[PDB]
Ligand SMILES: O=C(CO)[C@@H](O)[C@H](O)CO
């Protein structure tokens with residue numbers, strides 16, 4: 001028996017994994033988000049906890065615990081949690097999707113011209129370091145009282161164990177990590193006027209950080225089980241799925257589009273949207289990129305076409321007629337807008353639906369290509385989330401992208417599964433890592449049709465040209 | 476009684492008019508088109524005849540033609556029929572929608588610097604003259620044998636009468652005609668290595684060119700009746716609709732979109748996409764421009780939005796969310812039309828979409844008319860006909876957008892065959908006035924521009940034009 005916790009943005013999910021890969025029980029609790037001025041996105045750590053606590057007990061009361069040998073954590077990345085010397089919350093956490101600190105990203109990069117090299121990343125307002133420059137510039141009374149900065153999942157760890165600890169995948173997201181070295185950068189820390197004194201200790205995701213406190217273990221109906229370092233949600237997710245070694249990758253077709261690809265050692269393209277982090281396992285790194293959200297776009301397209309749903313939209317796409325010429329659908333994730341180009345008399349809601357599917361696919365494919373151009377070459381890609389559910393569209397995507405696309409079972413549990421697996425790892429020291437990294441069961445595999453792939457390439461050239469030409473119009 | 480024949484592209488139509496000018500009977504026969512190569516559009520002139528024969532025979536079953544007093548023809552314009560000295564058909568007819576001779580179009584304009592001045596037109600591959608340069612250049616063996624070049628309806632005439640003749644409206648479409656002078660242009664003909672001897676005799680539409688041959692008359696159950704010159708399909712259509720004097724104008728929102736306006740004498744502004752020809756009546760001239768098929772668009776906006784019928788649609792659009800930002804529909808006129816939906820957001824469903832189509836087609840049509848008007852046409856009203864014209868809502872929208880009074884009438888169904896018959900009427904009743912014999916169709920409803928909605932539309936028209944231009948190069 002193992003426990004995985006995921007500290008999400010919309011809420012907390014906790015699971016119970018069996019000695020096998022089976023999830024036995026699951027509980028979920030909602031979080032709210034706060035927005036007290038513009039570009040601000042905040043939560044309070046206490047609510048993180050109260051929800052987590054609440055969840056573990058819902059969990060306890062659904063199935064028996066105390067068979068549990070280990071517990072792992074995951075969470076939303078990049079969140080600044082500031083603690084005073086008593087371990088009291090200095091101010092509400094500043095989240096990944098907070099945008100207050102643009103000017104500070106600038107200064108930070110100016111103070112450390114080698115920052116892109118050290119971190120392997122473009123500085124963003126949602127990353128941790130610049131948030132801290134912001135506090136010191138604006139909330140100095142608060143800045144002066146800082147004893148520690150934790151990432152959100154590591155706040156939970158504190159409450160859970162009394163230790164200050166992170167994993168490499170999360171810490172990588174602070175911009176205080178030397179990603180190549182898997183250790184803090186004194187240069188980056190100083191420039192924010194901080195020291196290692198104020199960082200948590202660094203672990204690999206599979207490593208033990210401590211154990212439940214007696215109190216907490218009592219509250220929860222279980223022993224002082226060991227707690228592992230865990231990961232950031234995307235990495236922990238990938239661990240869950242089995243995407244753990246070089247050139248393995250997964251594409252998320254849900255509400256929150258992401259491509260995640262394990263790299264052959266550390267790589268970077270620091271002047272792009274391609275970010276590079278430690279994985280939540282020893283000796284691994286990954287790339288990742290925000291994408292077109294397929295699920296969002298299909299939802300909208302459904303309404304736009306008047307087909308009132310996605311399954312209906314996909315169904316209709318299948319009915320489109322094959323002698324009609326290509327229409328091009330151009331989606332602009334940027335504020336969720338679009339263009340149909342090349343409409344003729346031969347184009348009904350069917351044709352229109354096909355064009356939506358193809359154009360989302362055109363975009364997804366190009367997004368993947370961008371990652372790959374950084375030095376990743378997948379043998380296949382694993383497909384998760386709501387838009388992965390159609391057999392027709394999986395095949396389209398493979399034909400367009402030229403990737404073998406894998407659909408697996410259980411791809412849908414989220415980072416919590418990864419956190420649980422990490423626990424299971426640490427609890428089986430006798431076995432090698434490589435005997436301990438299950439992939440999810442292969443439910444269907446989609447190889448690209450060579451003719452269809454070839455016919456799509458020129459359409460993709462056309463897509464790119466049109467997207468490019470109209471972009472400044474839709475902006 | 477009277478007969479009108481319309482030699483179309485996709486079929487022939489014959490009609491029987493009574494003394495009072497009503498259609499008493501009609502008959503249609505289908506035609507195929509042959510496309511041996513990309514950009515080639517051809518028909519066998521023999522198929523024109525067999526189709527016309529069939530049709531007239533069928534007509535006669537329905538009703539005796541023994542009391543017909545005159546006969547008229549109209550036809551698909553610009554078709555090149557090449558005959559030898561024995562009236563042998565030398566090759567298949569190269570039609571108006573053939574695009575094989577673009578190069579020749581340029582060559583011709585280079586050769587005859589004043590060509591746009593003489594023809595009143597910019598040279599198009601659909602026009603007759605460049606077609607003949609192409610044959611000269613690509614089929615010299617054929618060219619060597621040319622005795623006669625006939626437009627399609629005029630080949631029909633020869634088969635019916637044994638005469639070689641055309642009218643000013645069809646002849647204008649050759650690019651060999653001096654449109655100002657209503658006579659062939661030696662300059663234009665020479666430049667193609669042709670002479671007047673290779674052209675038919677020219678008439679006005681309403682003049683008699685001959686009579687049915689006995690064998691033909693007999694086969695069709697009629698007298699050796701007099702035959703008028705007729706018109707090209709557009710001009711003949713206009714005559715049927717009563718479009719007849721300077722600044723009369725019609726907009727056909729049918730399966731084939733046209734704006735047709737009778738001008739004050741001859742008007743030349745070629746630089747441009749307005750065409751200028753002779754009208755099928757004496758001392759009459761006209762401008763024309765291909766337009767969107769508002770009909771074949773409205774139908775599409777319907778099925779597109781999965782709306783059922785042209786009034787489902789027109790109704791969806793009125794449920795359009797006022798607070799929604801605009802979707803922009805940009806329809807690009809090639810029949811062939813290609814469209815863009817620009818600026819779609821979360822706010823948009825089928826109601827919005829349907830609104831966008833109406834307004835965008837509207838915007839296109841208004842700009843289309845403006846261009847023609849800028850040439851020197853000033854209508855008191857615009858006659859509005861065709862299946863596209865059926866919606867009251869849209870007709871008004873069109874008026875609001877355009878600033879133009881739109882007169883809705885019924886009965887533009889019949890087509891060029893009507894005008895053809897009207898022409899025969901004229902010739903057969905030489906004492907009667909055109910006022911008498913060429914009435915307007917029934918006025919159904921007159922749409923005046925709403926001053927408030929017109930003003931509201933103007934900035935949208937400006938915006939449309941801006942956007943349309945921007946994407947224009949992308950539509951090739
Ligand atoms: O549109 C025009 C060209 O002037 C008509 O000629 C039709 O092409 C058929 O006659």
Ligand SMILES: O=C(CO)[C@H](O)[C@@H](O)CO
Nearest residue numbers: 076077078096233234256
């Ligand atoms: O992936 C990251 C970090 O780059 C964030 O946690 C968001 O994706 C949450 O949706």
Ligand SMILES: [N+]
Nearest residue numbers: 030032047050
């Ligand atoms: N709460």
Ligand SMILES: [N+]
Nearest residue numbers: 067068069427
């Ligand atoms: N044990």
Ligand SMILES: [N+]
Nearest residue numbers: 107136137138
């Ligand atoms: N400062």
Ligand SMILES: [N+]
Nearest residue numbers: 311312315316
């Ligand atoms: N279906």
Ligand SMILES: [N+]
Nearest residue numbers: 494495496911
């Ligand atoms: N009469």
Ligand SMILES: [N+]
Nearest residue numbers: 506507508509
């Ligand atoms: N055909």
Ligand SMILES: [N+]
Nearest residue numbers: 514515516572
């Ligand atoms: N063609």
Ligand SMILES: [N+]
Nearest residue numbers: 669670671672
């Ligand atoms: N001559």
Ligand SMILES: [N+]
Nearest residue numbers: 689690693699
């Ligand atoms: N006779």
Ligand SMILES: [N+]
Nearest residue numbers: 940941944945
């Ligand atoms: N312009």
